[PDB]
Design a protein around this ligand. Structure first.
Ligand code: WKM
Length: 461
């Protein structure tokens, strides 16, 4: 037998195809060749472990697109990839392909979609997603096509919050947790449709800057970067530095021209050159994740968007079995919390309790109610002191336990509704030692408070 991997590489692609069939060759996309952070030529024959393809305005049948994708990867790698999942909402599609050696490592495949907007605004924008387990590691993938238009960044932020609330991926037992907490690694990509927010009269200046590869002054006005910096969207997500030209809006059949001027076909809106097409991620604390490419193709010109690629190294763990767990506790293992308190932004006064969720526990654990005090600056402080239960992991082996994570929800005793969710890594500097812990708490992806204190982890070593 193959040894189980402790690392895999994942290819993420996002392309708004502009309702046009692709050209006969799209291999440059899967090879991370073009502009930006590109992949070394020496890696060209080396397959990624998993390929996740997100399309928007995709005119192809699932069958048509699968044939082009599989044939493309076969030509690059000489490997016949297995289809893990395919899911389409209108013209928004996600395909997950993996090397055949991974077929038995992949389980718990989930697909879902969310339609964004109401009446007028419901009919073609939203998201599709896929999750699964790769051995002991949970992976989520979201392909979203958000509201278009330079003057709708707020709508895009709203679309993002509706997708992260309502996309039903991952372990349904994680009931207090949205997709931004359910996965070891979460990749969120698509035509996010955020624009370079400069005056219309500066169109030709923007084009000039693009021809000089001087992106700095454009990225300082990129609505996704500015909204993220003001914590309006994609809180606690990462994005690699952008070093490729804006991927929208091109004249078709060339990349020599940006088509930005207002037309009946655009609803009389300008489309200033923009980084519409993006890849972000969020991984659990102290898990290996390294972006190894982030760029756009130069040679695929059927759409008014260029394809975007990103590749990642992602840490993965094995499906651990001991003499004891799974199927029982390992009395040599324990997780203890000392001097713990939650700080909440809520103006309400109910009692709160904690829930601890982790795949290292047989099931989730509910604490006693904490003691509410007033913070010096208005805040609600919920004190747990030394009252939190002792968590009993299924496996005590430090090779397993130090790789695990504890999700925390703080819940109202009156309503059992979560006011905040966060995550604590057990990748500690020491065992049998009081060490500080910390997580921000979010609800619907917005900051709602903090959890901090100390942890004491006992393993079999
Ligand atoms: C399975 C579905 C998501 C299907 N592929 C689809 O896109 N639609 C049917 C339901 O309503 C929206 C349109």
């Amino acid at each position: 037998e193959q040894p189980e991997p402790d690392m895999i590489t994942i290819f993420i692609g996002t392309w708004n195809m502009g309702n046009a069939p692709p050209p006969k060759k799209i291999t440059s996309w899967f090879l991370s060749k073009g502009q930006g952070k590109t992949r070394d030529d020496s890696a060209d024959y080396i397959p990624h472990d998993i390929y996740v393809i997100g399309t928007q305005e995709d005119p192809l049948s699932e069958k048509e697109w699968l044939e082009i994708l599989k044939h493309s990867l076969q030509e690059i790698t000489s490997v016949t990839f297995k289809t893990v999942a395919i899911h389409t909402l209108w013209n928004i599609r996600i395909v997950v392909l993996a090397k055949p050696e991974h077929e038995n490592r992949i389980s718990h495949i989930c697909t879902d979609n969310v339609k964004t907007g109401i009446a007028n605004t419901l009919g073609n924008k939203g998201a599709v997603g896929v999750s699964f387990m790769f051995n002991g590691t949970s992976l989520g993938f979201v392909n979203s096509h958000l509201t278009s238009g330079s003057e709708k960044k707020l709508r895009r932020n709203q679309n993002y919050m509706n997708i992260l609330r309502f996309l039903a991926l991952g372990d349904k037992k994680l009931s207090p947790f949205n997709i931004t907490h359910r996965f070891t690694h979460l990749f969120w990509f698509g035509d996010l449709n955020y624009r370079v927010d400069l005056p219309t009269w500066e169109a030709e200046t923007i084009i000039q800057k693009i021809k000089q590869q001087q992106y700095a002054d454009l990225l300082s006005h990129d609505q996704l970067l500015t909204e993220r910096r003001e914590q309006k969207v994609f809180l606690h997500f990462e994005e690699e530095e952008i070093t490729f030209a804006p991927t929208y809006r091109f004249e078709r059949l060339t990349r020599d021209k940006y088509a930005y001027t207002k037309q009946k076909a655009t609803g009389m809106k300008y489309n200033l050159p923009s980084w519409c097409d993006r890849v972000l991620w969020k991984s659990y604390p102290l898990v290996h994740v390294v972006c190894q490419s982030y760029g756009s193709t130069s040679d695929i010109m059927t759409s008014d968007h260029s394809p975007v690629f990103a590749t990642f190294e992602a840490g993965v763990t094995s499906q651990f079995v001991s003499k004891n767990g799974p199927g029982t506790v390992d009395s040599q293992g324990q997780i203890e919390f000392l001097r713990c308190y939650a700080t909440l932004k809520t103006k309400s006064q109910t009692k709160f309790y904690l829930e601890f969720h982790s795949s290292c526990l047989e099931s989730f654990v509910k604490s006693q109610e904490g003691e509410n005090e007033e913070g010096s600056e208005g805040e609600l402080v919920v004190k747990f002191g030394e009252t939190l239960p002792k968590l009993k992991p299924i496996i005590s082996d430090p090779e397993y336990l130090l790789d695990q994570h504890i999700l925390i929800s703080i819940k109202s005793s009156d309503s059992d509704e979560s006011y905040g969710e966060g995550c604590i890594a057990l990748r500690l500097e020491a065992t049998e030692t009081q060490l500080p812990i910390y997580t921000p708490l979010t609800h619907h992806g917005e900051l709602t408070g903090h959890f901090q204190g100390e942890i004491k982890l006992q393993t079999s070593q």
